[model samples]
Target: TSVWTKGVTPPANFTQGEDVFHAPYVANQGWYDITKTFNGKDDLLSGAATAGNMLHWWFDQNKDQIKRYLEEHPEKQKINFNGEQMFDVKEAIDTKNHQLDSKLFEYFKEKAFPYLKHLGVFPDHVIDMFINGYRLSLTNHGPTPVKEGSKDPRGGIFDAVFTRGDQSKLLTSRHDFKEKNLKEISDLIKKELTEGKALGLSHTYRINHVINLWGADFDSNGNLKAIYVTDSDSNASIGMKKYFVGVNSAGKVAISAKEIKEDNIGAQVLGLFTLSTGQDSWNQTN
Candidate 1:
């Protein structure tokens, strides 16, 4: 009875793994603007931490049913966590029964990303909370330091996982946006939007911040004009805002309040990642 349909359907040859769970992407999955709820608070929650909190929220909300389900299905109790390890469902229930939120939050903080990556499937409700939290978590309060000895230079763990997940794709990763790459980046953004996909804009706002790009604007001549984005740093009450895109004085792609009249105030765009490919949806279509 759902109104939404599948955005991306599983391939004909696709087979579900015995140990993994699947959550399909539905068309037009809705989300909340966390900024409105938080009201521009300082040091609120990093995009990564926010994602962790979201998974915790979902677990808390559905703990009863989840526990009952786990109790009934012993096969699901032992999860193939990260391929290299196993996660005990009963342990999670036991921890919840004893320490409540703190221990549970810690559990999710450490395991959510890897759980999502390895399971490759989840309930729509769980995915909903995760996507919403992850979106808000992209706020750029400061630069993220690269982890020591990590292969990927991206500092945000949640950002890296969702951006590179099976349902998502990585579009670009450049050191900084220069004049030469402006058109390329802009075109890619436009193309993703046109194809009905959300994007993650990794850029420098004082330091580095990641936000969602849902739409774009164009001039009469079809030139890229402005982009519509949901910035966690901005007041969430206002929701999505449009900012003009242009090259800053340093030749990096930047966004400004106005059409780049002056270069000093713009936030530099560093990299781009695709969030959803219109094919993935949260609703059942059949």
Candidate 2:
């Protein structure tokens, strides 16, 4: 109950959470641009959330359902990830993974950066939502909540748990490395993070949890605004210990995390840029 307390101000009479995001189903496993979460049949097909045409499913924001599921399964009582390899700055130095690392970094900037800057998603954003929400077994999506066995456009809480990565159906990648110990080398890497990576090159959108959150709806402008949250769940996650980090182009660094557990756990929330990773070409005003 306290888990959805974070993020989104004013808790009651609101909507949105893990089981309820913009009334859409997000892509939580791999980085593929998909739309919609309902396949009409659970076993027939698995729905996905993508950046383009993103709005698809209405997430159900409730925790009791999750508890009920856990009560029965008892197997995945705790959080389980797909076991994908996290990105490391050292890989930029390895003679073998150097290009791959470079490309990885680049892929993030070009392909996914724009959506993030303009939006504020999680894995990168929803990924953050799912991990934190699911870890506590809470539903933190953005939409209307349906009661147990109630007929609401938004479905009931998920009865099954999705263990990503370490699976054959998912795409996973990782690299081990140690970089040169030089002031310039360190500075170079920092610049990449601060500058924002180029799109035509790498794929390093930071969220590593193997979970991506998705949502879509037409705004007052009548255009669709899609939101996605991706996670780069790292075993070596240093930034995560803190819930928030404050950094900018002016070379400022401040980080902090507040346990926000009860806001509108199930209502549509907009996504946009929240961090200042140098590789972000989007902000490359220079």
Candidate 3:
């Protein structure tokens, strides 16, 4: 729903205050596709991934169980069209309902959903986004753009109906959460901060926490400055970034803790990663 004005490209030579604000990607960017068009979106992706990927990482905690449960249902494995990526954590959690992994969803009111609700973010769109997926996944293999009613041989590639919580808000199936929902994410962050649960962000210890900070006011000579939030729960400051990427495209690559974005926004490594692993994996793509 949000759109930038004509020629309103986010600066490659952006002056902090003159260019951007502290808005979450939910408010600033639209789909992941358009965001990819930005110069420094991979940086945004890193944070966005950190911000959202927790849900994925959370589920990964129980994958052993997930894999075990499905092992008996080897027949179900037949549906794995993309065998290589089928086991990839990203594809499994790509949609809420398709997942046999039900740990995150016990109900709508519990877990991440309520946190998102408390944050002042929109909840309905979350449902809608998932519903959109159901229609697609129940039809296409997913992210497969097409007209609404066309039939598919996959007995529905995507489950199009957006899943919702029932009696207890406990999500009983993986179909329950929509990972791509933005407004819902915005709300969740607000709730977490207000409830004193930002401490939840300190859950990881394997990597450094980083952020690209800026302001409307420039240094006297006019240059932007940056600050890094070291990954730590022991630190006096918390809620530091734990996941994200930073790949340089047209210039030398970097993963520094300080802020520096010149002609490097288009870099493939700009997206955030959980650690150097995701960074390393993505660098291969570039």
Q: What is the C-alpha RMSD of each candidate to the true structure, in Å?
A: 14.7, 22.9, 18.7
| Local accuracy of candidate 1 as per-residue lDDT tens digits, 86-182 | 3454564344322113333333334443223212211221223232212212233322222222222112222222332333323222223444456
TM-score for predicted model 2 compared with the true structure? 0.18
Q: Report lDDT per candidate.
A: 0.40, 0.22, 0.24
At residue 260, give the lDDT of candidate 2. 22
Best by lDDT: 1
Candidate 1 ranges with C-alpha deviation above 4 Å: 1-31, 36-180, 277-286
| TM per prediction | 0.45, 0.18, 0.24
- Candidate 3 error regions (>4 Å): 1-52, 75-286
Worst lDDT run of 10 residues, candidate 2, spans 51-60
Candidate with top TM-score is: 1
